[PDB]
Amino acid sequence: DIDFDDLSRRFEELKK
Amino acid sequence: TSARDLLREMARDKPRLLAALEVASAAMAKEEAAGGEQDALDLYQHSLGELLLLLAAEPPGRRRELLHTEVQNLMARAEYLKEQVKM
Ligand SMILES: [Co+2]
């Protein structure tokens, strides 16, 4: 099971 | 053979996946170069966006497991680099 919620949160944070 | 080499070989039939992995490879090369930090972050961000969607599209199997491992690692490398840059 891949936690896409965690990954999507982390990705938005990284992008800044 | 590293996990990354193997993922690349499993991706031989999927040019979009190979291309996203090459962008990630450039990010890691940039992280090793003097002055390369911002370019690395930009390459990490771009490749990660693509790889996340490719991971969502991937059917279950060994390639998906390898891709998930690589995405987790790339995200962590980029996060750490971003903190270093922020200083
Ligand atoms: Co793109």
Q: Is B45 at the interface with chain A, CB within 8 A?
A: yes
- Method for this entry: X-ray
Q: In the numeric block, which tokens belong to residue B25? A: 């490879």
> What does the angle CA B21 – CA B44 – CA B56 come to, to the nearest 5 degrees?
60
Query: Which of B41, B49, B64 is CA-nearest to residue B19?
Result: B49
Q: Is B44 at the interface with chain A, CB within 8 A?
A: yes
Q: Mutation target for B interface from A1, A11, A13, A16: give the one with most B CBs within 10 A.
A: A11
B52:A7 CB<8 A: yes
| Secondary structure of residue A16 in the 3-state scheme | coil
Locate the domains of chain B by residue range. 13-87
Comparing CB atoms, the residue among B52, B56, B68 nearest residue A11 is B52
How many CB atoms are located within 10 Å of the residue B49 CB?
Answer: 15
- B13-87 sits in which CATH class? mainly alpha
Q: What Rg value do the Cα atoms of chain A yield, rounded?
A: 8
**Distance from CA of residue B42 to its chain's centroid?**
12
